[PDB]
RNA sequence: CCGUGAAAAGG
Protein backbone atom coordinates (compact mmCIF):
# COMPACT_ATOMS: atom_id res chain seq x y z
CA UNK A 1 0.00 0.00 0.00
CA UNK A 2 0.94 3.71 0.02
CA UNK A 3 3.28 4.58 2.91
CA UNK A 4 5.60 7.44 3.94
CA UNK A 5 7.52 9.01 1.01
CA UNK A 6 6.32 6.69 -1.67
CA UNK A 7 6.22 8.78 -4.91
CA UNK A 8 3.02 9.20 -6.97
CA UNK A 9 1.71 11.21 -9.93
CA UNK A 10 -1.57 12.92 -9.06
CA UNK A 11 -3.90 15.64 -10.33
CA UNK A 12 -5.35 18.31 -8.01
CA UNK A 13 -9.21 18.65 -8.28
CA UNK A 14 -10.06 21.29 -5.59
CA UNK A 15 -8.82 23.61 -2.82
CA UNK A 16 -9.53 23.17 0.92
CA UNK A 17 -10.62 25.79 3.47
CA UNK A 18 -6.90 26.43 4.16
CA UNK A 19 -6.09 26.64 0.43
CA UNK A 20 -4.37 23.22 0.35
CA UNK A 21 -4.62 21.08 -2.81
CA UNK A 22 -6.89 18.00 -2.83
CA UNK A 23 -5.88 14.82 -4.67
CA UNK A 24 -7.56 11.36 -4.89
CA UNK A 25 -5.27 8.33 -4.72
CA UNK A 26 -6.83 4.83 -4.68
CA UNK A 27 -9.69 5.58 -2.25
CA UNK A 28 -7.57 8.02 -0.17
CA UNK A 29 -7.90 11.82 -0.08
CA UNK A 30 -4.51 13.62 0.02
CA UNK A 31 -3.88 17.25 1.04
CA UNK A 32 -0.84 19.06 -0.45
CA UNK A 33 0.39 22.66 -0.11
CA UNK A 34 1.32 24.89 -3.08
CA UNK A 35 -0.75 22.81 -5.56
CA UNK A 36 -3.69 24.34 -7.51
CA UNK A 37 -6.58 22.55 -9.34
CA UNK A 38 -5.56 21.23 -12.83
CA UNK A 39 -1.85 20.98 -11.76
CA UNK A 40 -0.21 17.57 -12.09
CA UNK A 41 2.57 16.82 -9.66
CA UNK A 42 4.84 14.10 -8.55
CA UNK A 43 3.71 13.80 -4.94
CA UNK A 44 5.82 12.54 -2.05
CA UNK A 45 3.63 11.17 0.80
CA UNK A 46 4.34 12.73 4.22
CA UNK A 47 1.76 10.77 6.25
CA UNK A 48 -1.11 8.45 5.39
CA UNK A 49 -3.76 6.94 7.76
CA UNK A 50 -6.96 5.06 6.77
CA UNK A 51 -8.84 7.63 4.58
CA UNK A 52 -6.69 10.79 4.70
CA UNK A 53 -3.08 11.62 3.79
CA UNK A 54 -0.62 14.49 3.38
CA UNK A 55 1.82 15.04 0.52
CA UNK A 56 4.52 17.42 -0.75
CA UNK A 57 5.28 18.52 -4.34
CA UNK A 58 8.52 16.78 -5.54
CA UNK A 59 8.13 18.17 -9.12
CA UNK A 60 5.50 20.19 -11.03
CA UNK A 61 4.61 18.33 -14.24
CA UNK A 62 2.07 20.91 -15.41
CA UNK A 63 1.28 24.22 -13.65
CA UNK A 64 -2.11 25.98 -13.46
CA UNK A 65 -2.81 28.99 -15.72
CA UNK A 66 -3.91 30.73 -12.46
CA UNK A 67 -0.59 30.25 -10.61
CA UNK A 68 1.19 33.53 -9.76
CA UNK A 69 4.90 32.47 -10.06
CA UNK A 70 6.20 34.43 -12.04
CA UNK A 71 6.31 36.22 -8.67
CA UNK A 72 8.86 35.83 -7.27
CA UNK A 73 11.97 34.91 -5.21
CA UNK A 74 9.28 33.77 -2.71
CA UNK A 75 7.73 34.61 -0.16
CA UNK A 76 7.59 30.78 -0.17
CA UNK A 77 4.76 30.01 2.31
CA UNK A 78 6.64 31.11 5.51
CA UNK A 79 3.16 31.11 7.08
CA UNK A 80 2.24 34.68 6.04
CA UNK A 81 0.79 34.27 2.53
CA UNK A 82 -0.79 30.81 2.14
CA UNK A 83 -2.78 31.88 -1.03
CA UNK A 84 0.10 33.97 -2.50
CA UNK A 85 0.79 31.39 -5.23
CA UNK A 86 -2.76 32.11 -6.53
CA UNK A 87 -3.47 35.02 -8.93
CA UNK A 88 -5.56 37.73 -7.29
CA UNK A 89 -8.85 37.24 -9.26
CA UNK A 90 -8.89 33.48 -8.32
CA UNK A 91 -8.29 34.43 -4.64
CA UNK A 92 -11.56 36.43 -4.75
CA UNK A 93 -13.50 33.59 -6.44
CA UNK A 94 -12.15 31.10 -3.83
CA UNK A 95 -13.32 33.30 -0.93
CA UNK A 96 -16.75 33.75 -2.47
CA UNK A 97 -16.94 29.94 -2.89
CA UNK A 98 -15.90 29.40 0.76
CA UNK A 99 -18.83 31.55 2.01
CA UNK A 100 -21.48 29.77 -0.17
CA UNK A 101 -20.11 26.32 0.90
CA UNK A 102 -20.10 27.02 4.65
CA UNK A 103 -23.57 28.60 4.45
CA UNK A 104 -24.82 25.37 2.83
CA UNK A 105 -22.83 22.74 4.78
CA UNK A 106 -23.47 24.27 8.28
CA UNK A 107 -26.44 26.71 8.08
CA UNK A 108 -28.27 24.59 5.46
CA UNK A 109 -28.90 27.78 3.45
CA UNK A 110 -28.71 27.18 -0.33
CA UNK A 111 -31.18 29.99 -1.15
CA UNK A 112 -29.31 33.29 -0.62
CA UNK A 113 -27.31 35.54 -2.97
CA UNK A 114 -23.62 35.77 -1.99
CA UNK A 115 -22.06 38.73 -3.80
CA UNK A 116 -18.58 38.25 -5.29
CA UNK A 117 -15.71 39.18 -3.00
CA UNK A 118 -14.92 42.93 -2.85
CA UNK A 119 -11.21 42.92 -3.65
CA UNK A 120 -8.41 45.32 -2.85
CA UNK A 121 -7.08 47.61 -5.62
CA UNK A 122 -3.44 46.94 -4.47
CA UNK A 123 -3.57 43.66 -2.48
CA UNK A 124 -0.06 43.91 -0.97
CA UNK A 125 1.73 45.67 1.94
CA UNK A 126 -1.61 46.32 3.68
CA UNK A 127 -1.14 45.32 7.36
CA UNK A 128 -1.01 48.13 9.92
CA UNK A 129 0.16 45.74 12.69
CA UNK A 130 3.11 43.27 13.04
CA UNK A 131 3.26 40.79 16.01
CA UNK A 132 6.77 39.24 15.59
CA UNK A 133 8.29 36.48 17.81
CA UNK A 134 11.88 36.97 18.92
CA UNK A 135 13.98 33.81 19.21
CA UNK A 136 17.51 32.39 19.21
CA UNK A 137 18.15 30.62 15.88
CA UNK A 138 21.61 29.24 14.84
CA UNK A 139 23.31 31.24 17.59
CA UNK A 140 21.80 34.59 16.51
CA UNK A 141 18.83 36.67 17.76
CA UNK A 142 16.23 36.64 14.97
CA UNK A 143 12.86 38.10 14.07
CA UNK A 144 10.56 36.03 11.88
CA UNK A 145 7.37 34.01 11.56
CA UNK A 146 6.58 30.44 12.68
CA UNK A 147 6.24 27.75 10.03
CA UNK A 148 2.72 26.31 9.80
CA UNK A 149 1.85 23.78 12.54
CA UNK A 150 5.17 24.52 14.30
CA UNK A 151 7.08 26.96 16.47
CA UNK A 152 10.00 26.79 14.04
CA UNK A 153 11.03 30.41 13.41
CA UNK A 154 11.92 31.32 9.81
CA UNK A 155 14.22 34.41 9.88
CA UNK A 156 12.67 37.21 7.76
CA UNK A 157 13.23 40.90 6.90
CA UNK A 158 10.54 41.36 4.17
CA UNK A 159 7.07 40.24 5.32
CA UNK A 160 5.26 40.91 1.98
CA UNK A 161 1.81 41.92 3.31
CA UNK A 162 2.94 44.48 5.96
CA UNK A 163 3.17 48.25 5.70
CA UNK A 164 6.88 48.47 4.67
CA UNK A 165 7.64 51.07 7.42
CA UNK A 166 6.57 48.48 10.04
CA UNK A 167 9.11 46.07 8.40
CA UNK A 168 11.96 48.61 8.89
CA UNK A 169 11.07 49.35 12.55
CA UNK A 170 11.12 45.58 13.30
CA UNK A 171 14.57 45.23 11.58
CA UNK A 172 15.89 48.30 13.44
CA UNK A 173 14.61 46.90 16.75
CA UNK A 174 16.26 43.53 15.96
CA UNK A 175 19.62 45.22 15.29
CA UNK A 176 19.30 47.19 18.60
CA UNK A 177 18.42 44.04 20.65
CA UNK A 178 21.57 42.35 19.22
CA UNK A 179 23.82 45.40 19.99
CA UNK A 180 22.48 45.78 23.60
CA UNK A 181 22.73 41.95 23.94
CA UNK A 182 19.19 41.53 25.31
CA UNK A 183 18.22 37.88 25.87
CA UNK A 184 15.55 36.34 23.53
CA UNK A 185 12.84 34.04 24.95
CA UNK A 186 13.29 30.22 24.93
CA UNK A 187 10.06 28.23 25.31
CA UNK A 188 11.54 24.83 26.31
CA UNK A 189 14.20 26.07 28.82
CA UNK A 190 11.68 28.73 29.97
CA UNK A 191 14.41 31.40 29.97
CA UNK A 192 15.29 34.78 28.49
CA UNK A 193 13.80 38.24 28.32
CA UNK A 194 12.43 39.31 24.86
CA UNK A 195 9.36 37.33 23.78
CA UNK A 196 7.84 39.48 20.97
CA UNK A 197 7.94 42.82 19.18
CA UNK A 198 4.60 44.43 18.36
CA UNK A 199 4.55 47.40 15.99
CA UNK A 200 1.30 49.20 14.97
CA UNK A 201 1.23 52.12 12.54
CA UNK A 202 -1.69 54.44 11.70
CA UNK A 203 -2.61 53.98 8.02
CA UNK A 204 -3.59 57.65 7.57
CA UNK A 205 -1.68 59.29 10.48
CA UNK A 206 1.64 57.39 10.16
CA UNK A 207 1.93 57.31 14.00
CA UNK A 208 3.79 54.27 15.32
CA UNK A 209 3.44 52.41 18.61
CA UNK A 210 6.22 49.92 19.52
CA UNK A 211 5.55 47.26 22.23
CA UNK A 212 8.34 45.27 23.91
CA UNK A 213 6.84 42.00 25.15
CA UNK A 214 9.15 40.71 27.89
CA UNK A 215 9.22 38.03 30.63
CA UNK A 216 10.20 40.51 33.42
CA UNK A 217 9.83 44.21 34.39
CA UNK A 218 13.54 45.17 34.12
CA UNK A 219 15.20 45.81 30.79
CA UNK A 220 18.78 47.03 31.03
CA UNK A 221 19.49 50.21 28.98
CA UNK A 222 15.86 50.38 27.75
CA UNK A 223 16.01 54.21 27.64
CA UNK A 224 19.16 54.17 25.46
CA UNK A 225 17.50 51.65 23.12
CA UNK A 226 14.33 53.84 22.93
CA UNK A 227 16.48 56.96 22.13
CA UNK A 228 18.17 55.16 19.21
CA UNK A 229 14.92 53.87 17.63
CA UNK A 230 13.06 57.24 18.12
CA UNK A 231 15.99 58.91 16.23
CA UNK A 232 15.54 56.56 13.22
CA UNK A 233 11.71 56.73 13.25
CA UNK A 234 10.45 60.12 14.54
CA UNK A 235 6.91 58.93 13.72
CA UNK A 236 7.15 56.75 16.88
CA UNK A 237 4.87 58.45 19.49
CA UNK A 238 4.53 55.40 21.83
CA UNK A 239 6.85 52.76 23.19
CA UNK A 240 5.12 50.34 25.60
CA UNK A 241 6.14 47.28 27.62
CA UNK A 242 3.98 44.19 27.99
CA UNK A 243 5.00 41.73 30.71
CA UNK A 244 4.16 38.11 29.99
CA UNK A 245 5.72 35.85 32.65
CA UNK A 246 3.61 32.71 31.86
CA UNK A 247 4.09 29.53 29.80
CA UNK A 248 1.32 30.37 27.29
CA UNK A 249 0.87 31.00 23.56
CA UNK A 250 -0.97 34.25 24.24
CA UNK A 251 1.39 37.08 23.12
CA UNK A 252 0.21 39.62 25.70
CA UNK A 253 0.17 39.28 29.49
CA UNK A 254 -1.82 41.29 32.10
CA UNK A 255 0.63 44.14 32.91
CA UNK A 256 1.27 47.17 30.59
CA UNK A 257 3.75 50.03 31.15
CA UNK A 258 4.57 53.17 29.16
CA UNK A 259 8.35 53.40 28.55
CA UNK A 260 8.00 56.49 26.23
CA UNK A 261 5.46 59.04 24.91
CA UNK A 262 1.73 58.20 24.84
CA UNK A 263 0.02 54.85 25.55
CA UNK A 264 -2.01 55.20 22.30
CA UNK A 265 -1.68 56.30 18.65
CA UNK A 266 -4.28 58.23 16.65
CA UNK A 267 -5.58 57.06 13.24
CA UNK A 268 -8.58 58.06 11.11
CA UNK A 269 -11.41 55.80 9.88
CA UNK A 270 -14.26 57.38 7.83
CA UNK A 271 -13.00 60.92 8.71
CA UNK A 272 -13.31 60.30 12.51
CA UNK A 273 -10.17 60.36 14.78
CA UNK A 274 -9.58 57.26 16.96
CA UNK A 275 -7.10 56.74 19.75
CA UNK A 276 -5.83 53.17 19.85
CA UNK A 277 -4.14 51.51 22.86
CA UNK A 278 -1.69 48.62 22.47
CA UNK A 279 -4.07 45.83 23.62
CA UNK A 280 -7.18 47.24 21.85
CA UNK A 281 -8.27 45.54 18.62
CA UNK A 282 -8.03 47.67 15.46
CA UNK A 283 -8.76 46.26 11.96
CA UNK A 284 -5.35 45.39 10.46
CA UNK A 285 -6.36 46.56 6.94
CA UNK A 286 -7.74 50.09 7.28
CA UNK A 287 -8.47 50.78 3.56
CA UNK A 288 -10.73 47.66 3.34
CA UNK A 289 -12.18 48.03 6.87
CA UNK A 290 -13.57 51.39 5.62
CA UNK A 291 -15.42 49.56 2.77
CA UNK A 292 -16.52 46.73 5.14
CA UNK A 293 -17.94 49.33 7.61
CA UNK A 294 -19.63 51.32 4.80
CA UNK A 295 -21.11 48.03 3.51
CA UNK A 296 -22.55 47.30 6.99
CA UNK A 297 -24.09 50.82 7.10
CA UNK A 298 -25.75 50.43 3.68
CA UNK A 299 -27.17 46.97 4.59
CA UNK A 300 -28.64 48.36 7.85
CA UNK A 301 -30.56 51.24 6.09
CA UNK A 302 -30.19 53.55 9.10
CA UNK A 303 -32.67 56.43 9.77
CA UNK A 304 -32.45 59.47 12.11
CA UNK A 305 -34.70 57.70 14.67
CA UNK A 306 -32.81 54.37 14.85
CA UNK A 307 -31.31 53.07 18.11
CA UNK A 308 -28.26 50.90 17.47
CA UNK A 309 -26.63 48.49 19.87
CA UNK A 310 -22.89 48.04 19.06
CA UNK A 311 -21.97 44.71 20.62
CA UNK A 312 -18.18 43.87 20.78
CA UNK A 313 -17.51 47.57 20.06
CA UNK A 314 -13.74 47.69 20.74
CA UNK A 315 -12.61 51.30 20.53
CA UNK A 316 -16.05 52.07 19.00
CA UNK A 317 -15.09 52.39 15.31
CA UNK A 318 -18.50 51.11 14.11
CA UNK A 319 -20.67 52.78 16.77
CA UNK A 320 -19.13 56.24 16.33
CA UNK A 321 -19.06 56.08 12.49
CA UNK A 322 -22.90 55.65 12.45
CA UNK A 323 -23.56 58.02 15.37
CA UNK A 324 -24.12 61.13 13.18
CA UNK A 325 -27.10 59.67 11.23
CA UNK A 326 -29.05 57.95 14.09
CA UNK A 327 -30.78 58.74 17.42
CA UNK A 328 -28.58 56.84 19.95
CA UNK A 329 -25.68 54.36 20.04
CA UNK A 330 -25.28 51.86 22.90
CA UNK A 331 -21.96 49.88 22.98
CA UNK A 332 -20.57 46.98 25.10
CA UNK A 333 -16.82 46.08 25.32
CA UNK A 334 -14.71 43.43 27.15
CA UNK A 335 -11.37 45.20 27.98
CA UNK A 336 -11.36 48.62 29.77
CA UNK A 337 -8.40 50.22 27.90
CA UNK A 338 -10.63 49.92 24.75
CA UNK A 339 -13.86 51.14 26.44
CA UNK A 340 -11.90 54.16 27.80
CA UNK A 341 -10.71 54.66 24.23
CA UNK A 342 -14.46 54.43 23.30
CA UNK A 343 -15.69 57.15 25.72
CA UNK A 344 -12.69 59.33 24.85
CA UNK A 345 -13.16 58.65 21.10
CA UNK A 346 -16.82 59.79 21.45
CA UNK A 347 -15.60 62.94 23.25
CA UNK A 348 -12.79 63.52 20.66
CA UNK A 349 -15.23 63.61 17.68
CA UNK A 350 -17.87 65.59 19.64
CA UNK A 351 -20.44 62.74 19.73
CA UNK A 352 -23.01 63.06 22.53
CA UNK A 353 -25.39 60.26 21.43
CA UNK A 354 -23.09 57.21 21.96
CA UNK A 355 -23.18 55.31 25.29
CA UNK A 356 -20.44 52.74 26.15
CA UNK A 357 -20.08 50.35 29.12
CA UNK A 358 -17.57 47.70 30.22
CA UNK A 359 -19.09 44.20 30.36
CA UNK A 360 -19.83 40.99 28.51
CA UNK A 361 -22.32 41.59 25.66
CA UNK A 362 -24.97 39.42 27.40
CA UNK A 363 -25.21 41.35 30.70
CA UNK A 364 -25.38 44.89 29.20
CA UNK A 365 -28.32 43.53 27.15
CA UNK A 366 -29.88 42.15 30.38
CA UNK A 367 -29.30 45.60 32.02
CA UNK A 368 -30.62 47.44 28.88
CA UNK A 369 -33.73 45.18 28.73
CA UNK A 370 -34.58 46.09 32.37
CA UNK A 371 -33.60 49.78 31.79
CA UNK A 372 -36.26 50.06 29.01
CA UNK A 373 -33.92 50.82 26.07
CA UNK A 374 -35.59 49.52 22.83
CA UNK A 375 -33.04 49.12 19.98
CA UNK A 376 -34.03 49.02 16.28
CA UNK A 377 -30.68 47.57 15.00
CA UNK A 378 -27.94 45.28 16.28
CA UNK A 379 -24.36 45.56 14.96
CA UNK A 380 -22.03 42.76 16.15
CA UNK A 381 -18.41 42.13 15.22
CA UNK A 382 -17.28 39.11 17.29
CA UNK A 383 -13.79 37.49 17.28
CA UNK A 384 -13.08 34.22 15.38
CA UNK A 385 -15.02 32.06 17.88
CA UNK A 386 -18.33 33.86 16.99
CA UNK A 387 -21.30 34.53 19.35
CA UNK A 388 -22.55 32.50 22.35
CA UNK A 389 -26.09 31.04 22.35
CA UNK A 390 -26.87 33.26 25.36
CA UNK A 391 -26.02 36.38 23.32
CA UNK A 392 -27.99 35.26 20.25
CA UNK A 393 -31.18 34.60 22.32
CA UNK A 394 -30.85 37.82 24.37
CA UNK A 395 -30.33 39.79 21.06
CA UNK A 396 -33.47 38.30 19.45
CA UNK A 397 -35.61 39.28 22.47
CA UNK A 398 -35.00 43.05 21.99
CA UNK A 399 -37.35 43.15 18.98
CA UNK A 400 -34.63 44.74 16.83
CA UNK A 401 -35.84 44.12 13.29
CA UNK A 402 -32.34 44.26 11.66
CA UNK A 403 -29.02 42.60 12.59
CA UNK A 404 -25.78 43.24 10.73
CA UNK A 405 -23.27 40.52 11.57
CA UNK A 406 -19.65 41.26 10.61
CA UNK A 407 -17.47 38.11 10.75
CA UNK A 408 -13.83 37.13 10.29
CA UNK A 409 -14.77 33.39 10.30
CA UNK A 410 -17.59 31.97 8.10
CA UNK A 411 -17.64 28.66 10.06
CA UNK A 412 -18.90 30.28 13.31
CA UNK A 413 -20.94 32.98 11.46
CA UNK A 414 -22.99 30.30 9.68
CA UNK A 415 -23.59 28.40 12.95
CA UNK A 416 -24.80 31.67 14.46
CA UNK A 417 -27.04 32.47 11.48
CA UNK A 418 -28.67 29.00 11.63
CA UNK A 419 -29.61 29.84 15.24
CA UNK A 420 -30.96 33.30 14.35
CA UNK A 421 -33.29 31.71 11.74
CA UNK A 422 -34.99 29.54 14.41
CA UNK A 423 -35.76 32.80 16.28
CA UNK A 424 -37.41 34.40 13.24
CA UNK A 425 -34.48 36.04 11.46
CA UNK A 426 -34.11 35.50 7.68
CA UNK A 427 -30.71 35.94 6.03
CA UNK A 428 -31.29 38.75 3.50
CA UNK A 429 -27.81 39.45 2.06
CA UNK A 430 -24.15 38.50 2.42
CA UNK A 431 -21.10 40.45 1.21
CA UNK A 432 -17.54 39.01 1.51
CA UNK A 433 -14.76 41.62 1.85
CA UNK A 434 -11.01 40.89 1.32
CA UNK A 435 -9.44 42.21 4.54
CA UNK A 436 -6.62 39.63 4.28
CA UNK A 437 -5.34 39.30 0.68
CA UNK A 438 -2.74 36.56 -0.01
CA UNK A 439 -4.31 34.58 2.93
CA UNK A 440 -7.11 32.06 3.18
CA UNK A 441 -9.08 34.30 5.61
CA UNK A 442 -12.35 35.90 4.46
CA UNK A 443 -14.31 38.73 6.03
CA UNK A 444 -18.12 38.75 5.60
CA UNK A 445 -21.04 41.05 6.50
CA UNK A 446 -24.48 39.39 6.63
CA UNK A 447 -27.78 41.31 7.07
CA UNK A 448 -30.42 39.48 9.12
CA UNK A 449 -34.06 40.59 9.11
CA UNK A 450 -37.11 40.12 11.31
CA UNK A 451 -40.04 38.55 9.51
CA UNK A 452 -42.17 37.37 12.48
CA UNK A 453 -43.65 39.78 15.05
CA UNK A 454 -43.35 38.05 18.40
C1' C B 1 -11.62 27.32 23.47
C1' C B 2 -7.34 29.27 26.38
C1' G B 3 -5.12 32.40 21.51
C1' U B 4 -3.63 36.50 19.07
C1' G B 5 -1.47 36.63 8.87
C1' A B 6 1.74 32.06 11.20
C1' A B 7 0.86 30.76 16.57
C1' A B 8 4.20 23.87 18.25
C1' A B 9 3.76 22.09 23.09
C1' G B 10 0.49 22.03 27.21
C1' G B 11 -4.41 22.63 29.45
N1 LIG C 1 -18.25 38.46 25.31
C1 LIG C 1 -17.86 39.70 24.94
N2 LIG C 1 -18.54 40.84 25.25
C2 LIG C 1 -18.10 42.06 24.86
N3 LIG C 1 -16.96 42.26 24.13
C3 LIG C 1 -16.20 41.19 23.76
C4 LIG C 1 -16.62 39.83 24.15
N4 LIG C 1 -15.71 38.97 23.67
C5 LIG C 1 -14.79 39.70 23.00
N5 LIG C 1 -15.07 41.01 23.05
C6 LIG C 1 -14.28 42.12 22.44
O1 LIG C 1 -14.80 42.43 21.15
C7 LIG C 1 -13.78 43.00 20.33
C8 LIG C 1 -13.83 42.32 18.95
S1 LIG C 1 -13.02 43.33 17.75
C9 LIG C 1 -14.23 44.47 17.10
C10 LIG C 1 -13.83 45.93 17.34
C11 LIG C 1 -14.03 46.98 16.22
N6 LIG C 1 -14.44 46.38 14.91
C12 LIG C 1 -12.79 47.87 15.99
O2 LIG C 1 -12.34 48.12 14.85
O3 LIG C 1 -12.20 48.42 16.93
C13 LIG C 1 -12.45 42.79 21.06
O4 LIG C 1 -11.90 44.04 21.50
C14 LIG C 1 -12.78 41.86 22.21
O5 LIG C 1 -11.98 42.09 23.38
NI1 LIG D 1 -8.76 29.00 8.73
Numbering used by the authors: 1 to 454
Question: What are the paper's exact sentences on this?
Answer:
In this research, using protein-RNA crystal structures, we demonstrate that multiple structural determinants collaborate to establish the dual enzymatic activities of RlmCD, which has been previously shown to catalyze C5 methylation at both U747 and U1939 of 23S rRNA in some gram-positive bacteria. However, in S. pneumoniae and Bacillus subtilis, which both belong to gram-positive bacteria, RlmCD and its homologue YefA have been proven to be dual-functional methyltransferases to catalyze both m5U747 and m5U1939 in 23S rRNA. We previously determined the crystal structure of apo-form RlmCD, which highly resembles that of RumA and contains three individual domains, including the N-terminal TRAM domain, central domain, and C-terminal catalytic domain. In all structures, the cofactors were modeled as SAH, due to the missing electron density of the methyl group, while its density was clearly observed attaching to the base C5 atom of U747 or U1939, indicating that the complexes gained in the crystal structures all exist as the trapped enolate intermediate 3, given that E443Q eliminates the final step of proton abstraction from C5.
An 8-nt (5′-745GUUGAAAA752-3′, hereafter termed as U747L) or 12-nt (5′-743CCGUUGAAAAGG754-3′, U747SL) U747-containing RNA analogue representing the loop region of hairpin 35 alone or with two additional adjacent base pairs (743C-G754 and 744C-G753) was therefore crystalized with the construct of 1–454 of RlmCD containing a E443Q mutation, using S-adenosyl methionine (SAM) as the cofactor. The 743–754 base-pair in U747SL was modified to a G-C from an A-U to increase the stability of the RNA structure. In addition, in the RlmCD-SAH-U747SL complex structure crystalized in space group P1, each asymmetry unit contains two complex molecules that pack together through RNA-RNA intermolecular base stacking. In two complex structures of RlmCD with U747L and U747SL, the overlapped RNA loop regions show a highly similar U-shape conformation, with the U747 base flipped out of the RNA loop and engaged into the active site in the C-terminal catalytic domain of RlmCD, confirming that RlmCD recognizes U747 site majorly through the loop region of 23S rRNA hairpin 35. In addition, two extra base pairs (743C-G754 and 744C-G753) in RlmCD-SAH-U747SL show no obvious interaction with RlmCD, extending outward from the RNA catalytic groove. S2 Fig (A) In crystal of RlmCD-SAH-U747SL complex, each asymmetry unit contains two complex molecules (lime and pink) that pack together through RNA-RNA intermolecular base-stacking. (B) Superimposition of complex structures of RlmCD-SAH-U747L (marine) and RlmCD-SAH-U747SL (pink) with an RMSD for Cα atoms of 0.4 Å.
